[PDB]
């Protein structure tokens with residue numbers, strides 16, 4: 025059940041903001057899938073089964089936003105104007121990137137579909153894959169990712185700001201303090217790719233490659249950022 | 257209320273994963289129905305009333321996924337990364353097969369509509385009913401069914417894996433142990449039809465007939481599989 | 489006097505409460521002792537001296553006491569003989585003679601702290 | 610979170626018939642965190658603000674421990690400044706209290722003095738070897754520190770085994786938060802003459818006798 029035994033989960037009771045959020049989360053992974061058109065013929069039936077992978081990919085993403093949220097509300101169980109205000113924003117962002125992700129995960133599933141040699145379907149459906157559109161892709165999705173993590177960082181900061189009011193013991197502080205740093209290390213990679221793209225050094229695909237290569241190197245770059253703060 | 261009096265229901269309190277799931281379930285049986293187009297004229301009104309049966313059929317299916325889920329969460333009331341991870345998957349699958357079912361239950365309701373002699377509407381709407389499309393049908397739906405049951409089997413295995421932590425008494429074990437076997441006997445028929453189709457012995461409709469005939473013989477084939485494990 | 493010998497790790501206090509109810513219905517005092525190394529102090533003291541009226545220990549040492557001849561042959565009536573399980577009586581039998589009454593089945597278990605270790609090895 | 614916003618909070622609380630902060634001003638132990646917040650200049654700034662709190666009639670002139678404790682424990686003041694020992698008396702009162710970081714001042718936080726409660730044996734005593742046994746085997750133990758802490762809390766005990774129960778306490782966190790911001794007192798023999806100089810300097814400034822610039826002048830010599 026619990027991540028930490030030394031932490032006292034305050035929001036064990038389900039609240040309106042938890043109950044509300046859940047509904048707004050369910051509709052993300054539900055309408056992402058079911059926003060699709062009803063297979064009317066076998067031809068459409070086998071077409072809609074090509075889409076399972078894009079949603080599998082996306083929904084996995086969306087449950088991780090829910091799971092990092094479930095844990096925060098379980099932990100502090102806050103229900104104030106600031107938490108509300110941030111929560112609103114966390115979801116607002118999820119929602120605005122719900123179908124854009126559906127598209128990216130469709131787009132990436134066709135790119136990866138040709139590399140493994142499963143399918144050879146055209147990508148002229150997605151439009152002209154130019155530098156600017158591929159840069160906008162990196163800056164667009166990278167922003168949503170920076171944003172979702174930045175909000176979790178700020179929501180955990182709200183908990184640290186009200187540490188004395190929540191009655192956070194010495195062990196509970198280090199979790200909050202670390203969960204800020206953890207969400208901020210997480211929001212540093214999407215900020216970096218977004219920044220590298222926006223500056224545009226090479227003025228060609230070399231820019232988009234690097235920016236994409238930072239999401240593969242998430243764990244090793246998380247350790248590089250973390251080792252610089254411990255070494256001083 | 258309860259299936260077993262000797263079982264101590266731990267998840268009697270409604271949790272975020274129960275509350276969340278419910279929302280994702282409601283949207284299955286709600287959007288399956290209401291994904292339809294608004295009857296604008298009497299002609300469309302009587303058309304949409306032909307669809308009551310396909311959804312009646314499907315929704316009955318979807319409440320049984322919910323009811324086998326309601327019971328599991330009521331029983332153990334788990335809320336860990338593995339249960340979450342599996343739950344996600346259980347629903348992911350329900351959702352990806354929500355409209356495909358709508359189609360199958362429309363397709364089957366027109367096949368059955370002609371046998372009883374209620375309607376004689378054309379099936380050229382659904383497309384070319386060839387061997388390959390009818391085989392893909394069996395492998396497609398059979399997979400979703402194997403998958404949904406396989407997840408329940410794995411979720412009940414998570415409970416048995418944490419039997420000592422949940423404090424499962426001698427009576428509670430035999431329920432978990434049996435509920436794995438029960439979901440696995442249930443996931444053995446859709447695996448068998450799926451396997452028979454994929455191998456394709458007769459190379460003609462004789463393959464699709466057998467595979468379809470195993471869902472009629474669900475209870476007798478459940479007893480055949482069960483008697484072999486008791487006889488040894 | 490009805491003196492009983494049972495290990496100190498068991499429930500000698502709780503056994504004495506049965507003994508306190510026995511003296512009420514008859515009048516025989518029931519003292520319960522828990523000596524150290526009673527598995528090896530029983531065959532030496534009971535043979536020469538008096539020892540305990542009845543002895544409680546796992547059934548494995550009881551074959552050693554029957555061969556030496558330090559245990560009376562048990563003769564339990566069928567009405568009681570049926571109240572317990574059948575296989576339990578087989579663990580307290582030596583050369584076709586009942587040498588003890590089986591109480592309970594024990595076995596080592598892994599005791600773990602759920603606060604310090606939620607998923608143990 | 611800052612000392613400069615307490616006068617505003619007092620105006621808001623005085624409208625409802627309540628005080629903002631009452632603490633023992635008579636002892637310089639309690640005025641020191643504010644005085645030594647910035648630092649001399651830091652003390653001039655630190656003390657000048659304290660004088661203004663009494664000058665604006667936000668704090669009482671002869672605020673002692675008894676009335677400061679009773680006021681917060683009754684529910685007449687929303688705050689008070691005290692150590693671990695005072696919590697047990699608040700627990701007796703039906704008050705939903707919290708222990709937090711001291712308010713900051715001029716950006717830098719308040720630097721309180723960190724007392725290390727200690728136990729020493731007297732030179733002119735025939736029971737030297739009898740008291741040693743008590744401090745080690747009976748008092749500074751798992752059990753011995755419990756009996757004292759449950760009566761009136763000590764703070765962060767010196768015993769290593771109590772680290773678990775100390776960390777679990779949310780008040781020890783607030784106390785230890787203020788200790789890492791503050792510094793430990795030097796044991797030197799001049800502390801008596803120092804503390805006396807600070808005790809008088811605060812009382813003369815609080816009553817309305819000596820100026821803030823004239824206080825540090827007299828307190829330096």
Ligand SMILES: OC[C@H]1O[C@H](O[C@H]2[C@H](O)[C@@H](O)[C@@H](O)O[C@@H]2CO)[C@H](O)[C@@H](O)[C@@H]1O
Pocket residue numbers: 636637638639724800804
């Ligand atoms: O006030 C000056 C006084 O401060 C310190 O005394 C504290 C002591 O640390 C605590 O145990 C508590 O009881 O309050 C005292 C302040 O009232 C110094 O220890 C002492 O030397 C100094 O004079």
Ligand SMILES: [Cs+]
Pocket residue numbers: none
């Ligand atoms: Cs729609």
